[PDB]
């Protein structure tokens, strides 16, 4: 079986590169962040623009939703994160403390914590209610490209240009595991699998790898796309067939069969690096978004 993703909507309106797109956990919305300093919210099923959220002083590199779909957190070149009330558009808190661009961010499932990574080579864990920085982890020796909580929030995975993926204990802040491979190419993206047993890691040698992080074994590799320069989001697609989904520097979305590692589809239509993809929580829908020469988000749908 192969999916048959077809283009349904192109969402225009950002005036600079789009940096990240994420579906709300309840499925109703897509949020996008951009180098144009804005977050935009779009209807996930009709592509209709809903609203613009503003207040960062420089461009945004990431955005993430709380579990109840009511809050967003954004990570900006202005060295802060902001927590937003989606319904009002209001900035509830500004998280200050990183000393360089904030690159990546995520809520835990409970959504009482935010995790961030930054060009300042640290990982920070913040209290959502108060905005206080609870812990600063001296996590890496180079910019931190991704941070993600596992399904019960007890672990954080982090990746960095220093070539390392690390697993952290949320409560204690200690490093539980360091993953290294080959000649330590920069690690540009990492995230846990939905069941929390694996991590998917991108490296800037045109390669994605699925790891059993506790056993420290590489179970799968996904290749054939182009990824040498940018921190491109990748995804597990689980609503239909079990796929790996990633953007690419050759302007395509790649979809692989997770078990066989074969490419099952390439989605054409963007005109710049596809920096970000996201998979809808219940329907076979992909969101994709691209950099400066494109500036659009595309919504794709498959029968499987």
Partner 1 sequence: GSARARPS
Q: Which residues contact 259 (CB under 8 A, 6 or more apart)?
A: 220, 242
Could you say whether residue 84 binds partner 1 (CB under 8 A)? no
Residue with tokens 């399904």: 151
Of these, 9, 31, 62, 235, which contacts partner 1 (CB under 8 A)? 62
Measured from the CB atom, is 169 or 292 closer to partner 1? 292
Count of residues in contact with partner 1, rule CB under 8 A: 27
Could you say whether residue 35 binds partner 1 (CB under 8 A)? yes
Q: CB of 205: closest distance to partner 1 in angstroms?
A: 13
Residue with tokens 């499925």: 27
Q: CB of 75: closest distance to partner 1 in angstroms?
A: 9
Q: CB of 124: closest distance to partner 1 in angstroms?
A: 16
**CA angle, 52 as apex, 35 and 273 as ends, to 5°?**
35
Neighbours of 238 (CB within 10 A): 15
Measured from the CB atom, is 95 or 258 closer to partner 1? 95
* Cα–Cα distance for residue pair 105/260, rounded to 1 Å: 31
The interface mask with partner 1, positions 210-249, x = CB under 8 A, is -------------------xxx------------------
Of these, 21, 71, 73, 204, which contacts partner 1 (CB under 8 A)? 204
Cα dihedral sign, 35-84-40-267: positive
**CA angle, 176 as apex, 173 and 178 as ends, to 5°?**
115
* Cα–Cα distance for residue pair 173/175, rounded to 1 Å: 7
Q: What is the DSSP string of 131-145?
A: --EEEEE---SS-EE
Of these, 6, 58, 171, 219, which contacts partner 1 (CB under 8 A)? 58
If 0-12 CB within 10 Å is exposed, 13-18 middle and 19+ buried, where does residue 262 land? Answer: exposed
Could you say whether residue 139 binds partner 1 (CB under 8 A)? no
Q: CB of 6: closest distance to partner 1 in angstroms?
A: 27
Q: CB of 154: closest distance to partner 1 in angstroms?
A: 27
* Cα–Cα distance for residue pair 198/51, rounded to 1 Å: 36
Q: CB of 99: closest distance to partner 1 in angstroms?
A: 14
Measured from the CB atom, is 125 or 291 closer to partner 1? 291
Q: Residue 259 pairs with which residues in a beta bridge?
A: none
Could you say whether residue 59 binds partner 1 (CB under 8 A)? yes
Q: Which residues contact 185 (CB under 8 A, 6 or more apart)?
A: 163, 203, 204, 205, 207
Could you say whether residue 76 binds partner 1 (CB under 8 A)? yes
Q: CB of 67: closest distance to partner 1 in angstroms?
A: 24
Of these, 3, 9, 20, 277, which contacts partner 1 (CB under 8 A)? 20
Q: CB of 126: closest distance to partner 1 in angstroms?
A: 19
Residues lying near partner 1 in the complex (CB under 8 A):
16-17, 19-20, 33-35, 58-62, 76-77, 101, 103, 119, 143, 161, 186, 204, 229-231, 275, 291-292
């Amino acid at each position: 079986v192969k999916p048959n993703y077809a283009l349904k909507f192109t969402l225009a309106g950002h005036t600079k590169a789009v940096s990240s797109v994420k579906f709300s956990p309840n499925g109703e919305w897509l949020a996008s962040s951009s180098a144009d300093k804005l977050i935009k919210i779009w209807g996930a099923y009709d592509g209709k623009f809903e609203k613009t959220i503003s207040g960062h002083k420089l461009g945004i590199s990431d955005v993430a939703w709380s579990s109840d779909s009511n809050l967003l957190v954004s990570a900006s070149d202005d060295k802060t994160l902001k927590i937003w009330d989606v319904s009002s558009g209001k900035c509830l808190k500004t998280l200050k403390g990183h000393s360089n661009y904030v690159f990546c961010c995520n809520f835990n499932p409970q959504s009482n914590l935010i995790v961030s990574g930054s060009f300042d080579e640290s990982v920070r864990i913040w209290d959502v209610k108060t905005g206080k920085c609870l812990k600063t982890l001296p996590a890496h020796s180079d910019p931190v490209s991704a941070v993600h909580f596992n399904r019960d929030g007890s672990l954080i995975v982090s990746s960095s240009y220093d070539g390392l993926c690390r697993i952290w204990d949320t409560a204690s802040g200690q490093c539980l595991k360091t993953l290294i491979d080959d000649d330590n190419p920069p690690v540009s993206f990492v995230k846990f699998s939905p069941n929390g047993k694996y991590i998917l890691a991108a490296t800037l040698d045109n390669t994605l790898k699925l790891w059993d992080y506790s056993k420290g074994k590489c179970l799968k590799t996904y290749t054939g796309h182009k990824n040498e320069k940018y921190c491109i989001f990748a995804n597990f697609s689980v609503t239909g067939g079990k796929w790996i989904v990633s953007g690419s520097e050759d302007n395509l979305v790649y979809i692989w069969n997770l078990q066989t590692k074969e490419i099952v589809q390439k989605l054409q239509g963007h005109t710049d690096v596809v920096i970000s993809t996201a998979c809808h929580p219940t329907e076979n829908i992909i969101a994709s978004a691209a950099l400066e020469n494109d500036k659009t988000i595309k919504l794709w749908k498959s029968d499987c």
